[PDB]
């Protein structure tokens, strides 16, 4: 038989390991031959694995690159003018690749160039929230210094646009042993930990949603009119520049003004944490300088897209896509999600080969220049728009497979919530003292919902990989899942090798899964996900989830207005047609599913599998979010203080964010209501879309 | 058999009569009490007529009226303030309904209150072309002065637009006869033609199709959330009012200043159609002042939709649209048209009673509001939006059916070139000397396109009807037909009494249609059009057609640029991408074409069908058009100088207009090389939709 276990049980963890290698010998960052080299080789070993159609697509988009002879550093100069002290040139490289060349130094991605001199502000994470504490509360003054940053609970394009807006002439970002050296674990190589010299690359661009800079809208294709890089979407205006913690502790220990506030705001080196401005007594006259030379330019990137035809809905597509550009080696991010991607192509093409194919056309995509803006997958949805949106099913991610080796991990939409509980009912646990036991099982156990004890927590998909066009612009479902760590005993942020150089293949084998029986499982769950939705009769989402949660979310937000309930009065503040809304979408959701359990007529299925399909559509609203026009969904956006973290109903929430502050009331809450009836609106708009059809 | 040939024979032109009659016995005003009961009447008959489902769908939205107890009028005053002329206060009622009270008087909606004085000058048509005239070449000054302008060539929006740009401090509109006049022809209710104090009633909005000012993008439904007046979309800024021509003469007669410029500045008065500002010597004291005290109030509106669920396809909708409301009795404008509906609902019922349904849903609109600024279907369709762009398959417009009784006239997307014509050589002519010959042959004859003989002129889809929602901002494939004049032997604009209080229907029986012929023919080809788009196996809609216009139009545009070979020289500005994809779009549709033609398998049927109704679709841009975010679709939008007439290539037409007086040219010619850019890439996607799916 051609089912879902004979995918499954093609899918091995010898070959998982084996493509990993393949892919992680030497750099493919974004832009450079050898990441088009690697393109090349996909694109021919998934003809070869037995795909219908396998093309590379290709656009010209601004990149960043540090110049290889004008290097990038910080330095301590006294009053004199004499550099006392440098930050690095480059990370020391991990054993047995000190000859590996085309290693990129650790920069920050399109960062200015610039030579600020200055005294330095030490300012925790660079949250909304820390500024909001320097400002309001201590009544530091950040303009015209330079920001020390520690890396860690937001993406670093918010901490530099909040530094930008207090007005900061640079950031100096680093990584703090508290947030990326977990207790009891050894440095690399020895362990996973990450090394003084160790620092995390990464861009610093705000594009909410746009793609590449110069060509917001519109595919960069060969044609294209690109803005000047004045308009540019996204770019900071102020140098970064990132350092690891052995160079961070030299420009800190120095560091006199204000004590921190509290404990939340001191790291685990030794050091004061004072945060400034500048340096104590003795060393008052010292400042800091930056020297960043790194050049913006437009480059070509490749997307490779393979296709299987579907059987009988050719015109629907299940999209599996993740990135194959990396910072340097890309050991955990991209290559164990597309190690895995590769052979879930490999185990589709051997049924393939047999006779079988899907229901539904399946599309893979490697996508490039993720690493720089999610550019490759943004710029092929521009190209590609009209036919997502009127036959895109659904989207699954594939990037990091591991990030730990304690339990599962998923987000995704509501649609998918009942799809991923049956799916990993049917898979086997791979971890130790679950033997036997299914991956719900295990996952439940570990990782418990908030909300219903006996099931697993699901998380809200936010930003800062390449579902984003796809869920947040275009409102096709989407989902991601991998392996992560235990988050309770375990306070560091991502895994502490993320973006350097010691990201490697033996960073994966020897310490985070050598069996790559984790990988396997992964692959099970992603390739499980596709092979449902692409070979179910009827699409494989439940409304009646989404109604659930949404009235999870307008409990939400309402409370956060009800802290203020003397301008809810004053203002006549009201949440009741949200309320309203969600009812319907409860009500008219339950009819729905009863008449899909109901109905030999395919024009009914193909109906109700539109009416399905179009669900998540319905919540796109074409104007987009204030000033965010390519954030469209209106349950959901990356919260505009952390790319990464999904934020729910997420114009009412800023709307009423800080709105104790706002100098005009009035007006702050009239834009509270109109938040509130967009909102309803759309709630209702998309419930309606699962009443009778005529 | 239940074929188009009985549905078409059960239409009468009798029952249209009657119908007409019935809607035209009082005034049926927006917002008002007898414009709710018609409402509420047909309701009741469309559900009587057999239809499945009749509902009214209300909302709350800006309406204009004037102050009952303190009229509109202006006066030409003396240097002592005495006002020694009035404009009338009303219409001289038509014969027998001198009466009939609730006889709105002639009034420009939306006008602001105010109360300014000044002198006057002529603007003839108060085109963009007119204030180039005045201000570039007379070097005559609007700042501060009333202007008076003559209606016709243009929409008034535009003209009150161009004259509030200028500076004018107010705006008299005016029926001049050379316009509104035909030679020969009587003055109502002798004859067709206006009576001097006959008035054309209507707004002046410019709403670039947002609908209701209150509420763009959104319904203006039970909870919304209203901007307020100042932040309203699209309302004038300067007080307006129409007046006719016995009281236009005595504002003109004393004129001084400049002469016209040429004879094309000159009506039919006799007066000298001096351009001013002011009047002549002895008179160059008094001034002309306006007393506008309308008020503009949010008022409940009603439209009546009907449904007539598919048998095979009920989630496409095929849809029969057009109001109900007029500015008096509305002889001809919209009653003409809603008792062609009525009767279309009737003969599609009598069928639906013996067992027949057709094949797609059909949806039949009774609009309110369309004579405030499309108010009713816009709010409809932004309710709605969501099915409409998922399910949408064609909307056919019906407001007035006959403005003459010379020919057939058609406005509509090329994809529905080829069922009009096959439609038309299947009908009977009305037309005396063509009695046994189809209506296509008469048509032809009267109406040669410009571009192939024999074929008939199709023109493109403008605005200012209630079709502008779905086919400029949602992308729905729309047409619409009527009866008309012989253009070639009538320089008049419209008909003469449009608007007016002598559109009745004695006008329509008397001296336009007495045998109701042309209503009749009206009615079997907008019932034929929604006949075959909801019971066609394979919609009738020809790709090819859309490629040979689209090459019409990248020559067209092409040449406009031409015109300044040193600037698309020195700015290296091509039009290369835009033909590459306009023979692209050739190709592939011709492919497509072959396909549709070669494949028993519905879902290949029905994945085809979906590439022909999204085909429409895919010519949006959901960035919308420059400063006009309504506007979404590519290849045409309404005129940005005249509301009525559509414009092709618009977004690359509006970067190209004057634009030698830009002062930067790099900037414009820039701005041109985006729009190319932009349309390219759409034609390109376009394209792409018709390609093999997978
Ligand atoms: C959830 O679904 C329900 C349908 O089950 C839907 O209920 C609808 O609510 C609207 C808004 O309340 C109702 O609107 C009323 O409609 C009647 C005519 O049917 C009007 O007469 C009412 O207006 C009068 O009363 C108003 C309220 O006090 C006055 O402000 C106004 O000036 C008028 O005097 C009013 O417009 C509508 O009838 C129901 N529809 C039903 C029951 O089918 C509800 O709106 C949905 N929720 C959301 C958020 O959409
Ligand atoms: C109409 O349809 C045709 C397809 O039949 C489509 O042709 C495509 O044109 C693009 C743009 O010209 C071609 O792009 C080239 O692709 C190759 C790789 O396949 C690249 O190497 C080329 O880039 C090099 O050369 C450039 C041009 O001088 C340099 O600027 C550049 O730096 C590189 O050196 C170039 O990107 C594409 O190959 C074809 N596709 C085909 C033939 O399938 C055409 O684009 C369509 N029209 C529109 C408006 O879309
Ligand atoms: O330009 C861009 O937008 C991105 C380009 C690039 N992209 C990436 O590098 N993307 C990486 C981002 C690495 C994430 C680092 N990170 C994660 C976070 C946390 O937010 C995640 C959302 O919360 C869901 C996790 N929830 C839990 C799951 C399990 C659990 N458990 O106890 O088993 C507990 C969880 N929990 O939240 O307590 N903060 N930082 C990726 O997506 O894999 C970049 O960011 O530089
Ligand atoms: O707020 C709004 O947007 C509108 C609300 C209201 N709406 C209307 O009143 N709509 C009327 C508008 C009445 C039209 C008056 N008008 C028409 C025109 C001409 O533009 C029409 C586009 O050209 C197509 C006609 N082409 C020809 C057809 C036949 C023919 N022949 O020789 O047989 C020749 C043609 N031709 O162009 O030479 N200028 N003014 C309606 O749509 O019926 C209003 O305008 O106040
Ligand atoms: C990764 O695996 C690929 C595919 O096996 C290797 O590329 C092949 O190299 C052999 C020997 O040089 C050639 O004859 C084939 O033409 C290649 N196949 C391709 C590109 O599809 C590649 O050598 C491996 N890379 C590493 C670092 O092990
Ligand atoms: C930090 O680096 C700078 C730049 O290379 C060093 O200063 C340079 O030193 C060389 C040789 O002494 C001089 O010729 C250049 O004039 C210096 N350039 C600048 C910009 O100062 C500095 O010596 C280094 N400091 C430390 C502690 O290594
Ligand atoms: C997840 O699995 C459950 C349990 O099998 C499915 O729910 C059943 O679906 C069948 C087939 O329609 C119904 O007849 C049963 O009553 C359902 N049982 C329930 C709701 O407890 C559910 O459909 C699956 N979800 C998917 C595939 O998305
Ligand atoms: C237009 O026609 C309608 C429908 O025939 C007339 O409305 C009917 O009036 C009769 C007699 O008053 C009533 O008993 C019916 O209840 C009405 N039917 C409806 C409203 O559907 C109406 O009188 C006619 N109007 C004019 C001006 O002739
Ligand atoms: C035009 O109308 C105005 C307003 O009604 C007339 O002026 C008014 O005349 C009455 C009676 O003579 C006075 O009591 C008011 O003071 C006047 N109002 C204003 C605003 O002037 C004027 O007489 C009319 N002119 C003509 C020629 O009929
Ligand atoms: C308009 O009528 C023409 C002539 O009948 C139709 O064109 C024919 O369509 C049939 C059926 O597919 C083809 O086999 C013929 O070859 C076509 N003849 C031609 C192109 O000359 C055309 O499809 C009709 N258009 C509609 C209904 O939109
Ligand atoms: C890199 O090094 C120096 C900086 O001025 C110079 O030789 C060259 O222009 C630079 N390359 C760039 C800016 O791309
Ligand atoms: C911070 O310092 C700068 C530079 O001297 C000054 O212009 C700015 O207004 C100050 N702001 C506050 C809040 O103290
Ligand atoms: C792998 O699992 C073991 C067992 O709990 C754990 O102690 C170790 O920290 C894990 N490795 C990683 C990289 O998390
Ligand atoms: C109409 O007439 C006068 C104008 O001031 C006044 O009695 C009343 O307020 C007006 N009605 C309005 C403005 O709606
Ligand atoms: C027109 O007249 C006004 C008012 O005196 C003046 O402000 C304006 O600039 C003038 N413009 C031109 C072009 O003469
Ligand atoms: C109706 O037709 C006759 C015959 O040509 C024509 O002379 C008359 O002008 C027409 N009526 C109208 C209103 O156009
Ligand atoms: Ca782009
Ligand atoms: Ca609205
Ligand atoms: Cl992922
Ligand atoms: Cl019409
Ligand atoms: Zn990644
Ligand atoms: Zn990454
Ligand atoms: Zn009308
Ligand atoms: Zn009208």
Not at 42 to 69: C, M, R
Not at 90 to 95: G, I, M
Not at 527 to 547: Q, T, W
Request: hydrophobic share 35%; proline share 6%.
């Amino acid at each position: 038989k051609h089912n879902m276990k004979a995918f499954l049980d093609e899918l091995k963890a010898e070959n998982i390991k084996k493509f990993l290698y393949n892919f992680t010998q030497i750099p493919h960052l974004a832009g450079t031959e050898q990441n088009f080299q690697l393109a090349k080789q996909i694109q021919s070993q998934w003809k070869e694995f037995g795909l219908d159609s396998v093309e590379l697509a290709h656009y010209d988009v601004l990149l960043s690159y540090p110049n290889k002879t004008h290097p990038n550093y910080i330095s301590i100069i006294n009053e004199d003018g004499n550099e006392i002290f440098n930050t690095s040139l480059f990370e020391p490289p991990p054993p047995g690749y000190e000859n590996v060349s085309d290693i990129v130094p650790p920069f920050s991605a399109f960062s200015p160039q610039g030579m600020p001199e200055g005294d330095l502000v030490y300012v925790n994470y660079a949250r909304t929230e820390d500024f909001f504490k320097l400002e309001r509360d201590m009544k530091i003054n950040c303009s015209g210094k330079i920001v020390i940053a520690r890396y860690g609970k937001v993406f670093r394009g918010n901490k530099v646009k909040n530094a930008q807006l207090a007005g900061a002439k640079g950031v100096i970002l680093y990584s703090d042993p508290a947030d990326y050296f977990a207790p009891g674990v050894k440095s690399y190589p020895d362990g996973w930990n990450l090394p003084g010299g160790g620092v995390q690359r990464g861009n610093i661009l705000n594009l909410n949603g746009a793609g590449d800079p110069l060509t917001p809208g519109y595919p960069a294709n060969e044609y294209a009119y690109r803005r000047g890089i004045a308009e540019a979407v996204g770019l900071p205006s102020i140098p970064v520049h990132p350092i690891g913690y052995y160079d961070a502790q030299k420009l800190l220990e120095k560091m006199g003004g204000s004590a921190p506030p509290d404990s939340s705001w001191r790291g685990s080196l030794k050091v004061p944490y004072n945060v400034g401005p500048g340096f104590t007594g003795n060393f008052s006259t010292q400042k800091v300088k930056m020297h960043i030379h790194s050049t913006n330019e437009v480059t070509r990137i490749y997307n490779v897209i393979g296709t299987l035809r579907g059987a009988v809905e050719p015109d629907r597509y299940v999209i599996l896509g993740g990135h194959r550009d990396s910072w340097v080696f890309g050991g955990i991010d991209p290559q164990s999600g597309a190690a895995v991607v590769h052979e879930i192509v490999r185990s589709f093409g051997t049924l393939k080969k047999e006779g079988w194919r899907p229901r539904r056309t399946i599309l893979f995509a490697s996508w490039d220049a993720e690493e720089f803006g999610l550019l490759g997958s943004t710029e092929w949805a521009e190209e590609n728009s009209r036919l997502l949106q009127e036959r895109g099913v659904a989207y699954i991610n594939a990037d990091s497979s591991i990030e730990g080796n304690y339990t599962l991990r998923v987000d995704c939409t509501p649609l998918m919530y009942s799809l991923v509980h049956n799916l990993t009912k049917e898979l086997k646990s791979p971890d130790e003292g679950f033997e036997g036991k299914s991956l719900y099982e295990s996952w439940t156990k570990k990782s418990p919902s908030p909300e219903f004890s006996g099931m697993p927590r699901i998380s809200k998909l936010g930003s800062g990989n390449d579902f984003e066009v796809f869920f947040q612009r275009l409102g096709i479902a989407s989902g991601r899942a991998r392996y992560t760590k235990n988050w309770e005993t375990n306070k560091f942020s991502g895994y502490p090798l993320y973006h350097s150089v010691y990201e490697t293949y033996e960073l994966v084998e020897k310490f985070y899964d050598p069996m790559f029986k984790y990988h396997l499982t992964v692959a099970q769950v992603r390739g499980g996900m596709v092979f449902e939705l692409a070979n179910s009769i009827v699409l494989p989402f439940d409304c009646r989830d989404y109604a659930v949660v949404l009235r999870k979310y307008a409990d939400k937000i309402y409370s956060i207005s009800m802290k203020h309930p003397q301008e809810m009065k004053t203002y006549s503040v009201s949440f009741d047609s949200l309320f309203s809304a969600v009812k319907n979408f409860t009500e008219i959701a339950s009819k729905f599913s009863e008449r899909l359990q109901d109905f030999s007529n395919p024009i009914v299925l193909r109906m109700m599998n539109d009416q399905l399909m179009f669900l998540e559509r319905a919540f796109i609203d074409p104007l987009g979010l204030p000033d965010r026009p390519f954030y469209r969904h209106v349950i959901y956006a990356p919260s505009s203080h952390n790319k990464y973290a999904g934020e729910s109903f997420p114009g009412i929430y800023d709307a009423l964010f800080d709105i104790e502050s706002k100098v005009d009331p009035s007006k702050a809450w009239g834009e509270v209501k109109r938040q509130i009836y967009v909102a309803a609106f759309t709630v209702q708009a998309a419930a309606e879309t699962l009443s009778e059809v005529a």
